[PDB]
Write a protein that binds this ligand. Structure first.
Ligand SMILES: [Mg+2]
Ligand SMILES: [Mg+2]
Ligand SMILES: [Mg+2]
Ligand SMILES: [Mg+2]
Ligand SMILES: [Mg+2]
Lengths: 99, 101, 97, 287, 58, 250
């Protein structure tokens, strides 16, 4: 609800489009379990979708590791310091690509 | 005790080597020899696997009707690289880092 | 509050003890044994339920018939009351006639 | 095959992978939520909801439908009206062709059942088989069939091809023995002796028109020639047949199996047949 | 004791979350937390701005 | 010296048999000792995993008695008298201190008595499941064949090492013909181990096969299996239980 929620004003990071557009996401960490059943969509994404995404976005450093051992997750870090986690456990490859 | 590797590299002279073995057991047009007989099928495949270090799987012994099919099967290689080392072998872009152990 | 705070002790299950490693063995004693025995003849359990199924009323009736005369007095009286009630319910109450 | 090739490149099958066939395991219904349960489907207040509505068929006091319609003996006696399982000639031919019954051997009830040609239920007041005329055309077989009834058309169909048909009788106690003999030989009882028909049926089994097993075996030729003369064929002389010795064979009354005498005891464990010798026992059985 | 494990672990995670709002950890270099390789990071810093920095000088 | 084996029962004229290697346990590198032929309808049926599911679920549930009882409202101690009159006081109406409502009362709808869950599938379905399991464990390079389960010495280390040498898997289900004729070495070795299980052919079942990864039959066992499982297609409907004597059925 509005009253029960924070708010802000419409803004950008560093006047992004003024001089030159810059892509805010700068780091992306994938944790994908090599065995877990919930890490199936994640394994598909890494096996046949992460290379293309890396090529299309060369300003984002993508790390992927295989030591959650039961649950995957993607942690996105931005230029302005903000972090943002998203669950990719029990999701399809389409859903992970869209996310 | 020293475990054997699944990796198989089909030799270039295979089509020649195979024929030597055929001469040991069985005319022209040998690609179409039938193997409904089982004694000779066993002798041939045992020789081939003792040489090339590769036995046919039980799931592919009824798909080998003719020696042509044996040649076809021996023309496909097997990779002994798990996803571990196939991921970090595709000239990853510089901005993607994988970690394995 | 109705939620525990510390984590429970880990329930370690040994998926390869004798009872699990040999489950189901001899469940085709009939088909693979010239039909000398039948699968039901491996069901270990109550005298009145080995190889039979039914709703509660039939189960209680069967218990009464086969071990009713071996039951303790109070258990047997409870069983008779239960049969009486179930009869009334299954034969007079319900959505469907 | 094709699918067996698919399985090679899929993960190993195990108890972690199984599934029910879609459409089989219909989901369950429980009264929880705003849809399933607020009154859980039972409706407004009223004896419908409480589970106390009258017995099945109570029309609210108006005289029920199944009580305002008079009684009539549509079913009186039904437990004693005897029943017979039809054995159409179509079915007999079909069984002969595929090698289930053997026409080079007398066809009794035992050999109809041991070939799974008909299913006899003694306990439901089936007394035996009745040949029915269906398929009289296209029936071409030389069979010595012993049944428990026969329409005259079936008698024709069996004669026209040089065959003998005889209507026997079996009482409810011996019919079970003849239909499923191996159980009886397991019980250990000595073979009983067939009872004679009831009062109402002797005029049936003592008439040549029906090839009865108690009618005199001298009025038969007149019946056979009469049937042939009515149905426009020539009664073949069976006496010259290559295996007429077989078409002649018959079971005398008071016998269940062909080569077994009432009073014997079959020992299947040792492959033996035990016969009595006390004079009183023989007297009782031979009658 | 209610028998189970999922609710217990869920509550532990929620407690940890609350314990990382009060008493937040002393902030530390991003070059010490996990998932860090300097080379990829500096090259990405280059490519992000649309500039061909010489790697040694940068 | 090869050890061949032909299929005995008739094959339909439109299907060729399937084949498999015949290995030995007498040595680490004694695979491909011979070549064996296997009847198509028992080792190459349609995959049919859903039947495997039906059979495994029956094999789980048909032998279950649930020993859970909860005292109904009339089986709990006491509870006869009306606690307080209906009209006078200001409390809720109650006609016993043992209703389900009250603390310490009885369950309105709870596990009643020991419950049986038994049911039997058509025998043909269970035989079909056996055939499906065998063919799936063949198609996926998991079924093996052995001339015999003989071993050089009963030391379990040898058997587990050998199973490691050939990518058998975590667990092996060895099947022999009769419980009395299993050789001394294999029975001694497989008593100590945990994931290796030795059963006689009469005990083969779907669940115990889908559990273990690798299935290792002796040759007499495959003969026995072909005989006993091909008997189901092309048999009459029964006239009485097959335990009673029949003309042709041992
Ligand atoms: Mg329900
Ligand atoms: Mg009135
Ligand atoms: Mg009471
Ligand atoms: Mg009351
Ligand atoms: Mg209580």
């Amino acid at each position: 609800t509005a009253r029960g929620t924070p708010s802000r004003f419409l803004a950008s990071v560093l006047h992004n489009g003024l001089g030159r557009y810059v892509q805010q996401l700068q780091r992306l960490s994938f944790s994908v379990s090599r065995d877990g059943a919930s890490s199936r969509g994640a394994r598909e994404f890494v096996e046949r979708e992460v290379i293309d995404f890396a090529r299309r976005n060369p300003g984002v450093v993508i790390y992927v590791n295989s030591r959650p051992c039961c649950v995957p997750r993607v942690v996105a870090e931005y230029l302005n310091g903000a972090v943002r986690e998203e669950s990719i456990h029990c999701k399809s490859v389409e859903e992970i690509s869209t996310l | 005790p020293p475990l054997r590797s699944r990796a198989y590299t089909p030799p270039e002279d295979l089509q020649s080597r195979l024929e030597s073995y055929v001469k040991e057991v069985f005319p022209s047009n040998w690609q179409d020899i039938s193997l409904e007989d089982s004694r000779l099928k066993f002798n041939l495949l045992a020789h081939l696997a003792d040489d090339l270090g590769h036995v046919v799987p039980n799931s592919r012994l009824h798909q080998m009707c003719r020696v042509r099919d044996v040649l076809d099967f021996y023309n496909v290689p097997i990779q002994d690289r798990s996803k571990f080392d196939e991921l970090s072998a595709s000239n990853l872009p510089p901005n993607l880092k994988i970690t394995w152990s | 509050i109705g939620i525990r705070l510390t984590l429970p002790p880990p329930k370690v299950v040994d998926r390869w003890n004798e009872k699990r490693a040999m489950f189901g063995v001899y469940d085709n004693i009939g088909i693979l044994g010239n039909f000398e025995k039948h699968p039901k003849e491996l069901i270990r359990g109550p005298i009145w339920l080995r190889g039979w199924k039914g709703n509660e009323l039939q189960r209680c009736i069967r218990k009464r018939k086969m071990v009713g005369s071996r039951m303790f007095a109070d258990d047997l009286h409870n069983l008779n009351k239960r049969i009486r009630y179930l009869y009334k319910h299954f034969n007079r109450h319900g959505k469907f006639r | 095959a094709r699918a067996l090739d698919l399985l090679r490149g899929l993960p190993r099958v195990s108890l972690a992978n199984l599934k029910p066939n879609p459409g089989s395991k219909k989901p369950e219904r429980r009264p929880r939520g705003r849809r399933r349960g607020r009154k859980c489907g039972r409706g407004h207040k009223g004896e419908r909801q409480r589970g106390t509505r009258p017995r099945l068929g109570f029309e609210g006091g108006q005289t029920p439908f199944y009580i305002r319609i008079p009684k009539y003996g549509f079913n009186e006696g039904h437990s004693f009206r005897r029943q017979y399982k039809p054995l159409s000639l179509n079915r007999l031919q079909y069984l002969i062709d595929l090698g289930r019954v053997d026409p080079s051997q007398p066809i009794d009830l035992t050999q109809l059942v041991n070939g799974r040609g008909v299913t006899i239920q003694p306990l439901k007041r089936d007394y035996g088989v009745q040949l029915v005329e269906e398929g009289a055309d296209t029936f071409t077989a030389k069979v010595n069939i012993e049944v428990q009834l026969a329409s005259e058309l079936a008698i024709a169909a069996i004669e026209k091809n040089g065959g003998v048909v005889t209507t026997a009788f079996y009482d409810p106690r011996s019919l079970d023995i003849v239909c499923k003999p191996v159980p009886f030989f397991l019980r250990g009882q000595p073979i009983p002796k067939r009872m004679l028909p009831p009062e109402e049926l002797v005029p049936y089994y003592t008439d040549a028109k029906n090839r009865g097993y108690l009618a005199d075996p001298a009025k038969f030729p007149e019946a056979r020639l009469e049937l042939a003369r009515k149905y426009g064929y020539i009664l073949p002389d069976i006496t010259k047949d290559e295996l007429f010795k077989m078409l002649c064979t018959r079971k005398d009354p008071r016998q269940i199996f062909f080569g077994l005498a009432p009073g014997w005891v079959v020992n299947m464990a040792d492959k033996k047949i035990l016969k009595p010798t006390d004079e009183n026992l023989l007297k009782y059985y031979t009658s | 004791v209610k028998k189970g494990f999922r609710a217990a672990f869920r509550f532990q995670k929620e407690l940890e979350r609350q314990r990382l709002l009060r008493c937040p950890p002393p902030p530390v270099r991003r070059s010490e937390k996990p998932n860090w390789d300097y080379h990829a990071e500096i090259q990405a810093f280059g490519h992000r701005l649309q500039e061909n920095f010489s790697l040694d000088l940068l | 010296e090869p050890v061949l084996r032909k299929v005995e029962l008739p094959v339909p004229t439109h299907r060729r048999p399937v084949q498999a290697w015949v290995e030995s346990l007498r040595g680490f590198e004694q695979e491909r000792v011979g070549l064996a032929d296997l009847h198509p309808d028992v080792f190459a049926t349609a995959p049919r995993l859903d039947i495997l599911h039906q059979v495994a679920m029956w094999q789980k549930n048909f032998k279950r008695i649930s020993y859970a009882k909860t005292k109904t409202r009339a089986e709990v101690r006491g509870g006869g008298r009306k606690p307080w009159p209906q009209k006078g006081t200001g409390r809720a109406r109650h006609g016993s201190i043992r209703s389900p409502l009250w603390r310490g009362g009885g369950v309105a709808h709870g596990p009643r008595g020991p419950t049986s869950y038994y049911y039997m599938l058509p025998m043909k379905v269970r035989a079909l499941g056996l055939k499906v399991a065998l063919t799936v464990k063949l198609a996926q390079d998991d079924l093996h064949i052995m001339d015999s389960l003989e071993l050089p010495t009963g030391d379990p280390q040898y058997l587990t090492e050998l199973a490691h040498y050939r990518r058998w898997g975590d667990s092996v289900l060895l099947v022999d013909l009769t419980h009395e004729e299993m050789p001394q070495s294999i029975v001694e070795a497989t008593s100590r181990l945990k994931t290796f299980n030795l059963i006689p052919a009469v005990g083969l079942n779907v669940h115990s096969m889908l559990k273990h990864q690798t299935l290792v039959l002796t040759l007499p066992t495959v003969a026995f299996l072909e005989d006993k499982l091909l008997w189901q297609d092309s048999r009459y409907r029964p006239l009485y239980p097959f335990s009673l004597p029949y003309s042709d059925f041992p």
